[PDB]
Symmetry: none
Subunit: 153 residues, 2 copies
């Protein structure tokens, strides 16, 4: 897993509507919270993304953007997003399979899915926060807002 | 949609506990926040109401009261409220179907559901804040608290 201080691998991925989303596009404009998750329609990250949806104003505003990423293709993310109320971007690290996840050091080579890793990328494209919690343990979202809050005022 | 300056159409609707709630009952006592919503058990509605829930003291206090309104019947709002931890009123604009929603000009004729209409009704019963977003769009709740604050101090 890339650690704090590393330049964040740039990427171009399709969101749930088949639109292209590039990390570079936020450079100089917004800090970016990257939430990698293993698989759509599973218990743990459903709860995790539900928290994100419920606190969206803290993640998607004038100073911050939030991007969820997993290896699933757009149709999968669209169905789940629509059913779950995910109005933020769910990006497909689908083909190449897990290419971005591997570059961030959060890919499970054995199962073929991304681990629950989280990073905050600043306006310079530098990783300023990196998190990877133990299995079965949900991530601390108050932590993400604190991290984001430190990169503003 | 009804706009600021209009008298808010009065109503008497059943809440999730089958108790009668009438809008006029708040006149001369509290400003009322009306949050219409398309349907219970849907994603974006869940997110909006979880946000309201998470910040309830800001909408339900000495100066203000909040009522969420939808076409669903009492049983439907009761289960959703209990599972979601919603302690505020959820009113049934059920039969006649969406009559109140139609009166406020926020009823979606093709789908048979209220759109995301929000209103602030002051102590005289006049609409002081109005907005209507689509079922696929998300509302900015800061606008809600801001308008409620303007009728207080």
């Amino acid at each position: 897993m890339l650690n704090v201080g590393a330049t964040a691998p740039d990427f171009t991925l399709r969101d749930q509507n088949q639109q292209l989303v590039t990390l570079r596009g936020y450079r100089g404009a917004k800090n970016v919270l990257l939430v990698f998750f293993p698989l759509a329609f599973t218990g743990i990250c459903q709860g995790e993304l539900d928290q994100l949806r419920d606190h969206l104003p803290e993640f998607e505003n004038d100073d911050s953007a939030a991007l969820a990423i997993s290896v699933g293709p757009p149709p999968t993310h669209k169905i789940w997003a629509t059913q779950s109320g995910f109005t933020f971007p769910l990006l497909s690290d689908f083909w190449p399979h897990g290419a971005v996840s591997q570059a961030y050091g959060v890919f499970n080579e054995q199962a073929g899915i991304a681990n629950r890793g989280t990073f905050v990328v600043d306006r310079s494209g530098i990783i300023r926060f990196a998190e990877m919690k133990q299995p079965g343990e949900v991530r601390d979202q108050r932590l993400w807002t604190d991290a984001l809050a430190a990169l503003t005022a």
